[PDB]
Structure 1
Amino acid sequence: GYSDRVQQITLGNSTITTQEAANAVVCYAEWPEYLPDVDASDVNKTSKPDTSVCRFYTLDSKTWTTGSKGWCWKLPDALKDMGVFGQNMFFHSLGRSGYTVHVQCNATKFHSGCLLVVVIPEHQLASHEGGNVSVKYTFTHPGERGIDLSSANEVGGPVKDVLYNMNGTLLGNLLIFPHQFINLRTNNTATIVIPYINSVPIDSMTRHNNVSLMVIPIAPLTVPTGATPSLPITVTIAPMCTEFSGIRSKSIVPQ
């Protein structure tokens, strides 16, 4: 009586149940694991807070309306302030982590709409100015708020044009990245497990984000007659196999 459909994920002191899942994706078919010695470089023993950092943090909720263009969060940024995960983050020189991402959106059998939930490794954004204008730090570190693709261009911020993925590629091809759809008629959640993907064994958690999670409405939300025209979307994310190394004074970052 197991269905692909019902699932339970327990991680730390927190549990999620979905009764309307559509399997789960594990990026590149690899599950998060700690850093092996053969791959290690820094000689420091690392710190593995385990259950105090590897639990589920639910970010603040978004509201899908007929005019929504899509939202974008960066990792580990989105979690920069969650509990002890965040403290560890500002206090060590280097850290490394994988995540379980669970995006939630329920409706009824009269609604229609379909969101794309995708994880993009190394999502370098484009400046809407063109040329070689850079995208300032603050703009690519929105924190739990994430970036709202239907917000206005700002100065020093990225471009927010959806048919171009914020980088000069077409929305249609985002499907080459680990992703899952939430089609109100099928699905009510999306779950993706992200292994740590980098060109170095461990890195800085503040100067470099290693994935952007993106939720994009593709088939517009259509509510039943005289229904309220909107649904909330909630994102809950859990660091998994986290390791921190090179402890010290506590980083100070712009803004």
Structure 2
Amino acid sequence: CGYSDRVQQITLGNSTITTQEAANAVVCYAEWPEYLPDVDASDVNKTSKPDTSVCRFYTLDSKTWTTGSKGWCWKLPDALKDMGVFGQNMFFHSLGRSGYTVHVQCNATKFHSGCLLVVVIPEHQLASHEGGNVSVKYTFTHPGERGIDLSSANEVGGPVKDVLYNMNGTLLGNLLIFPHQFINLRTNNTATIVIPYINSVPIDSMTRHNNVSLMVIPIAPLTVPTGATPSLPITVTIAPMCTEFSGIRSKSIVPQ
């Protein structure tokens, strides 16, 4: 033996991520992602498994962690909708199912302090910022790889952006019932969460429905040492896993 729980390697396709100050990997509800079995299947079409071209790590854009920063939310598969062959099969097909490996980067020094809550939420239905029976419009729940900055302003047709109330009326402290992992700068620099396909249908449309949402939330505020720049980068890298596509057609057009 002599190995570490800290030093991990995830290889998927032609992409490889190494980490040396990891904590563990979280496997959501103790379940690895799989392909759709015949006993659960309903759609008669033979599914497409493009595995090497689509089950690979895609790196999202980086987010600046400041002291006054609130948090960021990403929707899946919406974040990976312009990313290579996966996003192309996402629009050319009417159906599709996918699991994910999410790896969130944030490295610092031993003088730094701060803690992030990386959490995956199944069916994270957002609340409108106006209340009542107001709905959230399509483009505000489908931002792409840019995600939702929760420290931004209220905008018409969009969701509420209070990080405390989790954008759905539940408090932030009870968000640990969902599959979660911390990034503590004294301990951790990465978080790995492996998501299976969680739905009440065997296979679903990947453009009108987001199965899970990924929230990176600073619980403890960022404290840089004296004279350091008051900023750290956060990077999100998501890889599809066991991805099937069914019902190929002529690329449906989504709003914007």
Q: TM-score range by the shorter chain?
A: over 0.9
Instruction: Tell me how far 1:38 sits from its aligned partner.
Output: 0.3
**SS class of match (1:174):** helix
**SS class of match (2:204):** coil
Instruction: Tell me how far 1:84 sits from its aligned partner.
Output: 0.1
**SS class of match (1:39):** coil
**SS class of match (2:79):** helix
Q: Tell me the distance in 2 between the aligned counterparts of 1:171 and 1:242.
A: 31
Q: Tell me the distance in 1 between the aligned counterparts of 2:199 and 2:42.
A: 14
Once superposed, which parts of structure 1, at least 4 consecutive aligned residues long, lie more than 3 Å away?
none
Q: Tell me the distance in 2 between the aligned counterparts of 1:56 and 1:19.
A: 18
Match of 2:252 in 1: 251
Match of 1:38 in 2: 39
Q: Tell me the distance in 1 between the aligned counterparts of 2:68 and 2:171.
A: 20
Q: Tell me the distance in 2 between the aligned counterparts of 1:23 and 1:250.
A: 39
1:16-70 deviation line (CA, Å, top 9, x unaligned): 0000000110000000000000000010000000110000000010000011000
Identity %, equivalent residues: 100
**SS class of match (1:78):** coil
For the aligned residue pairs, the C-alpha RMSD in angstroms reads 0.4
**SS class of match (2:99):** strand
Please, what TM-score do these two structures have when normalized by structure 1? 1.00
1:153-202 deviation line (CA, Å, top 9, x unaligned): 00000000011000000000000000000000000000000000000000
Match of 1:238 in 2: 239
Instruction: Tell me how far 1:219 sits from its aligned partner.
Output: 0.4
Instruction: Tell me how far 1:105 sits from its aligned partner.
Output: 0.2
**What are structure 1's unaligned runs of at least 5 residues?**
none
Match of 1:180 in 2: 181
1:108-154 deviation line (CA, Å, top 9, x unaligned): 00000000000000000000000010000000000000000000000
Q: Tell me the distance in 2 between the aligned counterparts of 1:113 and 1:95.
A: 38
Q: Tell me the distance in 2 between the aligned counterparts of 1:45 and 1:31.
A: 23
Please, what TM-score do these two structures have when normalized by structure 2? 0.99
Q: Tell me the distance in 2 between the aligned counterparts of 1:11 and 1:5.
A: 19
Q: Tell me the distance in 2 between the aligned counterparts of 1:179 and 1:2.
A: 24
Instruction: Tell me how far 1:2 sits from its aligned partner.
Output: 1.1
Match of 1:131 in 2: 132
Alignment length, in residue pairs?
255
Q: Tell me the distance in 2 between the aligned counterparts of 1:168 and 1:7.
A: 36
**What are structure 2's unaligned runs of at least 5 residues?**
none
**SS class of match (1:37):** coil
